[PDB]
């Protein structure tokens, strides 16, 4: 099954389509909306349903120029690493053998290994956090999570912060593996995100079940001649 197979009906629901209408309207009314329309669903593009190994929820897309490009916690090449991702990198550096601080915040290569980097809200107005949170995106991502729970087996979910924890509170904790911790934002990272060890634990679960671990060191697309 592909994402479109399992979400085709969901994407004909008014809460979904009216959301996209709203976004398209605001973009033409002098409001900058992030990410660009072609990037809104990049988490799905880069991590097909059958390839999901680890789900990491974000909440809102980043709301500044150059930041959001459709993957939770990631930013485009050449853009500063946002504080939440810096704290993820610090936990990685303290736990994954050989990890060192990347010089970029671009996480496509996680997605390409099976890490679904899913914000629960998929658009935002420039400079205004949570400004699209009361559209239909949470309903849409509730359905995404429900479908992974039902259609996949042995997925590791990393639920960071209360919002994410609530979002994933009904995941099957026997067929899947649910790990919780405070959010890596500077407001909460020292309240238990540091020390959560989720990246190693996720890889050990995956290993235990015959899946390859995630290489958490993210890499930029290369140059050609």
Residues 85, 216: contact at Cβ < 8 Å?
no
Query: Residue 28 belongs to what H/E stretch?
Result: helix 14-28
Structural contact between residues 67 and 34, judged by C-beta atoms closer than 8 angstroms: yes
Residues with catalytic roles = 60
Residue 224, helix vs strand vs coil? coil
Taking a C-beta distance cutoff of 8 angstroms, is the pair 31, 124 a contact? no
How were these coordinates obtained?
A: X-ray
Q: Please give the CATH number for the structural domain made up of 1-225.
A: 3.40.470.10
Residues shown for the chain: 225
Q: What Å resolution does this PDB entry report? A: 1.4
Name the nearest CA neighbour of 16 among 148, 146, 139: 139
Could you tell me the two tokens for 136?
């239909």
Domain map (residue ranges) of the chain: 1-225
**Sequence-ordered list of residues with C-beta below 8 angstroms from that of 9, at least 6 positions apart, any chain:** none
**In sequence order, which ranges of 36-187 are alpha helices (DSSP H)?**
42-46, 83-95, 108-111, 137-151, 161-167
């Amino acid at each position: 099954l592909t994402w479109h197979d399992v979400l085709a009906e969901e994407k004909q629901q008014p809460h979904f389509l009216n959301t996209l209408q709203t976004v398209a309207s605001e973009r033409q009314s002098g409001v900058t909306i992030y990410p660009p329309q072609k990037d809104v669903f990049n988490a799905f593009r880069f991590t097909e349903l059958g390839d999901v190994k680890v789900v990491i929820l974000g909440q809102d897309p980043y709301h500044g120029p150059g930041q959001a490009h459709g993957l939770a916690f990631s930013v485009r090449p050449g853009i500063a690493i946002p504080p939440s991702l810096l704290n993820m990198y610090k936990e990685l550096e303290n736990t994954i053998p050989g990890f060192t601080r990347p010089n970029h915040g671009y996480l496509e290569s996680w997605a390409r290994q099976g890490v679904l980097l899913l914000n629960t809200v998929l658009t935002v107005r420039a400079g205004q956090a949570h400004s699209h949170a009361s559209l239909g995106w949470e309903t849409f991502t509730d359905k995404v999570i429900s479908l992974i729970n039902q259609h996949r087996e042995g997925v590791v979910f990393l639920l960071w912060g209360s919002h994410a924890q609530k979002k994933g509170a009904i995941i099957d904790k026997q067929r899947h593996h649910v790990l919780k911790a405070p959010h890596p934002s500077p407001l909460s990272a020292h309240r238990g995100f540091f020390g959560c060890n989720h990246f190693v634990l996720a890889n050990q679960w995956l290993e235990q079940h015959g899946e390859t671990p995630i290489d958490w060191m993210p890499v930029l697309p290369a140059e050609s001649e």
